[PDB]
């Protein structure tokens, strides 16, 4: 049913979709790795999916499988990426072993950017402590 769901979401109301002036579309979905409404992008469209998303200081990895499509409360499995960037990429590749290259590449890029953002918000909010 993923194709049907995607086609309805495409030619009907993807509520998280925002139509930019260029004509490109952006899904507002927080779990979305690539914030662009496409076949590979909407977590709604695709049963198999993954994302790096920041919670507190941690940069967790969220996993989505067709097996837990029912029971959406427990759908997203939460994995802690190690603070070491190399270890984090290794863990992402391991968990995303035998996993389509699109989500893996996008997940790695999102982890890099979130790490940079965490570094730079530490920068902007440096305090006298320590």
């Amino acid at each position: 049913s993923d194709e049907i769901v995607w086609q309805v979401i495409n030619q009907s109301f993807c509520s998280h979709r925002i139509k930019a002036p260029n004509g490109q579309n952006f899904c507002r979905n927080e779990y979305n790795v690539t914030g662009l409404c496409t076949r590979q992008s909407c977590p709604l469209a695709n049963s198999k999916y993954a994302t790096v998303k920041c919670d507190n200081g941690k940069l967790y990895l969220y996993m989505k499988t067709p097996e837990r499509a029912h029971t959406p409360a427990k759908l997203w499995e939460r994995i802690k990426l190690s603070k070491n960037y190399t270890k984090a990429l290794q863990q992402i590749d391991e968990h995303l072993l035998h996993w389509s290259k699109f989500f893996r590449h996008k997940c790695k890029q999102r982890f890099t950017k979130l790490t940079q953002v965490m570094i730079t918000e530490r920068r902007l909010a440096l305090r006298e402590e320590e």
Binding site: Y85, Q109, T112
Partner: protein
Amino acid sequence: PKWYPSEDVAALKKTRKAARPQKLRASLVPGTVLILLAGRFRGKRVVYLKHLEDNTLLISGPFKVNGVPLRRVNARYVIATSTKVSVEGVNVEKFNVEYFAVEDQKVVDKALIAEIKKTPLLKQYLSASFSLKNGDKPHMLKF
């Protein structure tokens, strides 16, 4: 590999453009007098010695005659006159492009003066500058 590639790096396509040695204009020949059209010594007559690998002609005043030292000059900014001197007397092997990055000039100048003496009035020609007078039309003017 300490940073994963943000966005992507578009590799440039391989270029089928191999550099080849320059083919100089026919008039330029070793031992040919030259007129410089720009730079510090614009409008000053100089001798041509050899063509360098990096396409910069090498020229001597001689500094003895006209005070122009050994120097690199671009070919396109130069006019070639029909009068010649024999350059066989001067050997001009040692100095090269990388060398440019007094005694040598003296060694060159002695040999070049030796040939300059034979032709009448050439030293005076090299000493004096060149300029366009009124009524001078370059296109007819045979250089």
